[PDB]
Design an enzyme around this catalytic site. Structure first.
Site, PDB file in Angstrom:
ATOM      1  N   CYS A   1      -0.142   1.453   5.171  1.00  0.00           N
ATOM      2  CA  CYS A   1       1.123   0.885   5.638  1.00  0.00           C
ATOM      3  C   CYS A   1       2.231   1.892   5.978  1.00  0.00           C
ATOM      4  CB  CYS A   1       1.647  -0.113   4.597  1.00  0.00           C
ATOM      5  SG  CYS A   1       2.998  -1.111   5.228  1.00  0.00           S
TER       6      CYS A   1
ATOM      7  N   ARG B   1       6.368   1.131   4.464  1.00  0.00           N
ATOM      8  CA  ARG B   1       6.631   1.044   3.030  1.00  0.00           C
ATOM      9  C   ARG B   1       8.041   1.403   2.564  1.00  0.00           C
ATOM     10  NH1 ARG B   1       1.677   4.217   0.568  1.00  0.00           N
ATOM     11  NH2 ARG B   1       1.742   5.010   2.722  1.00  0.00           N
TER      12      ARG B   1
HETATM   13  C1  HEM Z   1       8.374  -4.467   7.107  1.00  0.00           C
HETATM   14  C2  HEM Z   1       7.480  -4.350   8.123  1.00  0.00           C
HETATM   15  C3  HEM Z   1       6.222  -3.717   8.059  1.00  0.00           C
HETATM   16  C4  HEM Z   1       5.694  -2.946   9.024  1.00  0.00           C
HETATM   17  C5  HEM Z   1       6.406  -2.485  10.279  1.00  0.00           C
HETATM   18  C6  HEM Z   1       4.352  -2.581   8.652  1.00  0.00           C
HETATM   19  C7  HEM Z   1       3.443  -1.947   9.532  1.00  0.00           C
HETATM   20  C8  HEM Z   1       2.102  -1.724   9.269  1.00  0.00           C
HETATM   21  C9  HEM Z   1       1.164  -1.137  10.208  1.00  0.00           C
HETATM   22  C10 HEM Z   1       1.441  -0.636  11.624  1.00  0.00           C
HETATM   23  C11 HEM Z   1      -0.073  -1.138   9.604  1.00  0.00           C
HETATM   24  C12 HEM Z   1      -1.395  -0.740  10.266  1.00  0.00           C
HETATM   25  C13 HEM Z   1      -1.789  -1.924  11.141  1.00  0.00           C
HETATM   26  C14 HEM Z   1      -3.090  -1.724  11.907  1.00  0.00           C
HETATM   27  O1  HEM Z   1      -3.265  -0.660  12.547  1.00  0.00           O
HETATM   28  O2  HEM Z   1      -3.931  -2.649  11.885  1.00  0.00           O
HETATM   29  C15 HEM Z   1       0.134  -1.730   8.284  1.00  0.00           C
HETATM   30  C16 HEM Z   1      -0.888  -1.982   7.378  1.00  0.00           C
HETATM   31  C17 HEM Z   1      -0.691  -2.547   6.109  1.00  0.00           C
HETATM   32  N1  HEM Z   1       0.544  -3.014   5.611  1.00  0.00           N
HETATM   33 FE1  HEM Z   1       2.336  -2.900   6.437  1.00  0.00          FE
HETATM   34  N2  HEM Z   1       4.033  -3.103   7.414  1.00  0.00           N
HETATM   35  C18 HEM Z   1       5.159  -3.847   7.069  1.00  0.00           C
HETATM   36  C19 HEM Z   1       5.185  -4.796   6.028  1.00  0.00           C
HETATM   37  C20 HEM Z   1       4.132  -5.010   5.152  1.00  0.00           C
HETATM   38  C21 HEM Z   1       4.223  -5.847   3.982  1.00  0.00           C
HETATM   39  C22 HEM Z   1       5.367  -6.806   3.626  1.00  0.00           C
HETATM   40  C23 HEM Z   1       3.108  -5.685   3.257  1.00  0.00           C
HETATM   41  C24 HEM Z   1       2.771  -6.333   2.031  1.00  0.00           C
HETATM   42  C25 HEM Z   1       3.622  -6.923   1.138  1.00  0.00           C
HETATM   43  C26 HEM Z   1       2.303  -4.747   4.007  1.00  0.00           C
HETATM   44  C27 HEM Z   1       1.062  -4.307   3.607  1.00  0.00           C
HETATM   45  C28 HEM Z   1       0.214  -3.516   4.374  1.00  0.00           C
HETATM   46  C29 HEM Z   1      -1.200  -3.317   4.075  1.00  0.00           C
HETATM   47  C30 HEM Z   1      -1.994  -3.850   2.888  1.00  0.00           C
HETATM   48  C31 HEM Z   1      -1.757  -2.681   5.141  1.00  0.00           C
HETATM   49  C32 HEM Z   1      -3.221  -2.267   5.334  1.00  0.00           C
HETATM   50  C33 HEM Z   1      -4.045  -3.484   5.781  1.00  0.00           C
HETATM   51  C34 HEM Z   1      -5.492  -3.146   6.154  1.00  0.00           C
HETATM   52  O3  HEM Z   1      -6.094  -2.252   5.508  1.00  0.00           O
HETATM   53  O4  HEM Z   1      -6.032  -3.794   7.083  1.00  0.00           O
HETATM   54  N3  HEM Z   1       2.934  -4.321   5.177  1.00  0.00           N
HETATM   55  N4  HEM Z   1       1.480  -2.072   8.068  1.00  0.00           N
END
Ligand code: HEM
Ligand code: HEM
Ligand SMILES: N=C(N)SCCc1cccc(CCSC(=N)N)c1
Ligand SMILES: N=C(N)SCCc1cccc(CCSC(=N)N)c1
Ligand SMILES: [Zn+2]
EC number: 1.14.13.39
Lengths: 416, 414
Positions: free
Chosen positions: B118, B121
């Site tokens: 992520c 974060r």
């Molecule tokens: C506030 C806005 C947020 C942005 C801009 C953001 C952006 C991203 C991006 C760009 C990725 C990679 C996506 C991909 O290439 O498929 C990602 C993955 C992830 N994010 Fe965030 N995130 C945010 C909020 C969150 C929140 C609220 C959570 C959980 C409470 C979260 C948990 C994760 C996790 C678990 C992954 C990895 C998922 C996987 O392995 O497929 N994200 N995030």
């Protein structure tokens, strides 16, 4: 299923199992605990100066392994020539502590090391490498002749040919044959009064080292540095490359007429010269190798990195882009054009160069070949995927297994 | 033991001591690095028909409880001690235990914080947590999921949220959301095996039709949700169109772009991942934040196995698609990403471009370095799919490892 890493290509949905990784005899930086894969110089391969002769026992098993790879490659494994060559190495190591390679053995290992390089995206060309045997070289002056010959043959007036020159291997308690410069061709990095740098910031240390050694510094943004060649147990001598041998390409854009006025340029021959070539235990401290550039190397990393020429802003300003807000993608736009300029300028000058699209596609082809030939191909994802348009190339969607196979190219400490 | 971490743009160096707290293993070994692999070969979350070894579950719980009390500066206090005995007591008697709302909230936020892939974060501290463990039916999950969507969307001013359904229970089916995201456009396999819509959603689209969904015939048909309650066939629920906000794509200067009829939804909400806190597993804990432009403009619209609209834009831009060296691909990619940002900003929907995003991640690394002595990060996922070295994160080494609480991948319910 198979007890080897399962590799998937998310674009085509295809699966493979790398069984070649079992062949890796040397550990890397990772542990089941954490992955240190993004580290550029993990303290692993790092061929730190190990003066006192190597454990005859260790060198032998490493040598026995290489000789096996060699006879296997010529399809004579188990033969009489194979067992005799084996006895020949063991005997030699028994009486002198080391051993030497046969001509054809050196050629084979040189190509294998390229073939085994995890960070090189152009390995589809691995079979085509001109090996110059210079293990007879005995003077820093002679090293300069060899290098000059290498640059001449490799440059070949723009129709570039891959090559490598191998100098004398490290000897027991004897000085190494070293090339202080990281590349045979490097632009100077002049430290300014205000603290900034004129030229290439990457080469500040080597530039200052050439000055401390008698070089009369210029003051340009693209001054070619002299070579600091070092024969065994002797301080390094300084050599100035004949300007005619160092072919360069002025950069211009196919449609933005003002780009040519920026006075930007790059040399055509990419030749690493500070890496160590290891074959069957033997270590070749000076063994410069060269191929041809992939446009993103010049257009994105060298010209746009924050710590290099950093010309992104200047170019964006000339394009009249809004450099005051990230959401204008002014960085992405100027980057594209700068890269298009490198490609266009090289093609125009009829100098060899390949774009990241063509390059990666061919690497995909390389992986399919190696899958059949060896059951896998060691690759470092962060290095294979281009610095721009990443997911637009096919390697981005190809999972990759990284590991160390010998022969190999390793990083080595700076002689100073 | 402690990895030296370097940034090649500034020369700065740090030592990651946070990785020392890793009690879970990754795919890597000293022999070969498997870090570029998306899914784990074994690190899955195997079935739960039997109770987890009490001795082990108990230690994950004790540690999490320790984590919770340290967070509120009441470590060793009376409450901390009597809470540990509660958990010891419950586990010893039933083979499991339950979390208190506040602990849940702490856990959820930590899970995000520990998410190596992520890039957003820096927002980890601001997460609205909806406790839905009070759920007993698929119809209830739907209402819950509809509130999350209403709240999270907030008429375009997105707010990050997560909704937690009942934890997994030994010998009992798991509450599951079959869809990978709460909003997905259907993928219809037509004529010559080609696909209309979103190719990544061919399977889920089919499973829906199989349960009585009246498929459409568009490229952007918002799919229905297949919610599943323990040991019960999944149920079909259509989302109210007014709940699912969407942004029509147009270009700042290229008049013809909008003509392409491209559109994308506002709410990025994963729903097929599993949340693990103190040994407890939550099989249905959908979460969302806001899109980073590159997820839409680069991956979703330009991936070869997704909408793959690259060539169309190129032809419309009247580019030389005859050769690679004309960089027609890189050129179209940039206008498409520009379109997404323009459109979203015009529709007043929250969105962050990859430059702003990675700059803030760098800060987060720094905030974390001081706070915990390191920050687990997966380089290949943090660096944007385009203009990689053009962002700061590209030049930053990173250490990747598994911390708990944590979000994990889990097998598909069907
Ligand atoms: C506030 C806005 C947020 C942005 C801009 C953001 C952006 C991203 C991006 C760009 C990725 C990679 C996506 C991909 O290439 O498929 C990602 C993955 C992830 N994010 Fe965030 N995130 C945010 C909020 C969150 C929140 C609220 C959570 C959980 C409470 C979260 C948990 C994760 C996790 C678990 C992954 C990895 C998922 C996987 O392995 O497929 N994200 N995030
Ligand atoms: C024929 C054209 C070739 C192309 C286009 C090519 C391209 C590349 C590129 C793009 C890199 C990474 C650049 C970077 O990120 O800094 C690389 C690395 C490397 N290449 Fe090749 N290569 C070619 C020829 C060669 C030759 C002839 C050899 C060896 C005989 C070779 C050995 C390596 C090694 C060892 C590395 C990694 C060096 C390091 O770790 O810094 N390459 N190559
Ligand atoms: N890169 C090529 N196109 S040909 C291989 C030699 C080469 C030339 C220029 C750069 C680097 C990458 C590593 S640079 C180094 N370790 N000094 C390798
Ligand atoms: N990415 C965001 N802008 S917020 C986190 C939700 C999210 C949305 C879209 C994609 C993925 C990553 C892979 S999605 C999956 N594991 N089913 C995560
Ligand atoms: Zn690894």
């Amino acid at each position: 299923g198979p007890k080897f890493p399962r590799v998937k290509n998310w674009e085509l949905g295809s699966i493979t199992y790398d069984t070649l990784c079992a062949q890796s005899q040397q550990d890397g930086p990772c542990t089941p605990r954490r992955c240190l894969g993004s580290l550029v110089l993990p303290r692993k391969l790092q061929t730190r100066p190990s003066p006192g002769p190597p454990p005859a026992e260790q060198l032998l098993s490493q040598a026995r392994d290489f000789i096996n790879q060699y006879y296997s490659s010529i399809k004579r494994s188990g033969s009489q020539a194979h067992e005799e060559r084996l006895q020949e190495v063991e005997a030699e190591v028994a009486s002198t502590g080391t051993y030497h390679l046969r001509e054809s053995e050196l050629v084979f290992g040189a190509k294998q090391a390229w073939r085994n390089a995890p960070r090189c995206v152009g390995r589809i060309q691995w079979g085509k490498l001109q090996v110059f045997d210079a293990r007879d070289c005995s003077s820093a002056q002679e090293m300069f002749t060899y290098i000059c010959n290498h640059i001449k043959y490799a440059t070949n007036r723009g129709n570039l040919r891959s090559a490598i020159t191998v100098f004398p291997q490290r000897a027991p308690g004897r000085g190494d044959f070293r090339i202080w410069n990281s590349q045979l061709v490097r632009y100077a990095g002049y430290r300014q009064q205000d603290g900034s740098v004129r030229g290439d910031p990457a080469n500040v240390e080597i530039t200052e080292l050439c000055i401390q050694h008698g070089w009369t510094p210029g003051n340009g943004r693209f001054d070619v540095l002299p070579l600091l060649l070092q024969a065994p147990d002797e301080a390094p001598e300084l050599f100035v490359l004949p300007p005619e041998l160092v072919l360069e390409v002025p950069l211009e854009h196919p449609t933005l007429e003002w780009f040519a006025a920026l006075g930007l340029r790059w040399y055509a021959l990419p030749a690493v010269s500070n890496m160590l070539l290891e074959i069957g235990g033997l270590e070749f401290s000076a063994a410069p190798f060269s191929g041809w550039y992939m446009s993103t190397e010049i257009g994105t990393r060298n010209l746009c990195d924050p710590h290099r020429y950093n010309i992104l802003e200047d170019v964006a300003v000339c394009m009249d882009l809004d450099t005051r807000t990230t959401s204008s993608l002014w960085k992405d736009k100027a980057a594209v054009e700068i890269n298009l300029a490198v490609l266009h300028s090289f093609q125009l000058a009829k100098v060899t160069i390949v774009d990241h699209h063509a390059a990666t596609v061919s690497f995909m082809k390389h992986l399919d070949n190696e899958q059949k030939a060896r059951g896998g191909c060691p690759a470092d994802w962060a290095w294979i995927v281009p610095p721009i348009s990443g997911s637009l190339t096919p390697v981005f969607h190809q999972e990759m297994v990284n590991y160390i196979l010998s022969p190999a190219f390793r990083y080595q400490p700076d002689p100073w």
